[PDB]
Design a protein around this ligand. Structure first.
Ligand SMILES: C[C@]12CC[C@H](O)C[C@H]1CC[C@@H]1[C@@H]2CC[C@]2(C)[C@@H](C3=CC(=O)OC3)CC[C@]12O
Length: 160
């Protein structure tokens, strides 16, 4: 209930950090049921874009999807376009980067608007957030105006 909040994406975004495998270590349950559990993605830079190949388990079945990602505007601001193709259907959109250390983690956020639905997912280079990345992610959630830490579900890559 309400319109989507004034999200202020980052102003320090480094695109060169996205290559190799990133694990989805946490998200909102609406995100896990719609885009899958056990989620990981391999990014492959292709000029200005990054091509995405992602694995997840959606309604008990395994899928690969594919996508392309591009920056919108000044790449430093953390507004990201992304296409998403799975089972012969393509979707596209823009999301915003809430927080990142330009090394280990990225928190992404999307909202669609008399009500609003919000989707939050957390990617990391490691299968578990430890140490540096964890303390960063927690201090962010404490001060955050739009993310409900209580609502984040953490992945257990223990999946089939
Ligand atoms: C921006 C986006 C556009 C397509 C649909 O409108 C859903 C939104 C919110 C979710 C968002 C897609 C665009 C694709 C995504 C980044 C995709 C992911 C790739 C990844 O590494 O983590 C998630 C799953 C779904 C996704 O998280």
């Amino acid at each position: 209930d309400g319109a989507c909040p004034e999200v202020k994406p980052v102003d320090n975004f480094d695109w060169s950090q996205y290559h190799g495998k990133w694990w989805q270590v946490a998200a909102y349950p609406d995100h896990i049921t719609k885009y899958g559990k056990c989620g990981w993605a391999e990014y492959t830079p292709e000029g200005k874009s990054v091509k995405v190949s992602r694995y997840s388990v959606i309604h008990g079945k395994e899928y690969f999807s594919e996508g392309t990602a591009y920056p919108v505007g000044d790449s430093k601001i953390g507004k990201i376009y992304h296409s998403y193709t799975i089972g012969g259907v393509t979707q596209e959109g823009v999301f915003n980067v809430l927080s990142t250390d330009n090394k280990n983690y990225i928190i992404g956020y999307f909202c669609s608007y008399k009500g609003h639905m919000d989707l939050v997912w957390v990617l990391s280079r490691s299968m578990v957030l430890t140490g540096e990345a964890k303390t960063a992610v927690e201090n962010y959630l404490i001060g955050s105006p739009v993310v409900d830490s209580q609502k984040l579900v953490y992945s257990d890559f223990s999946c089939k």
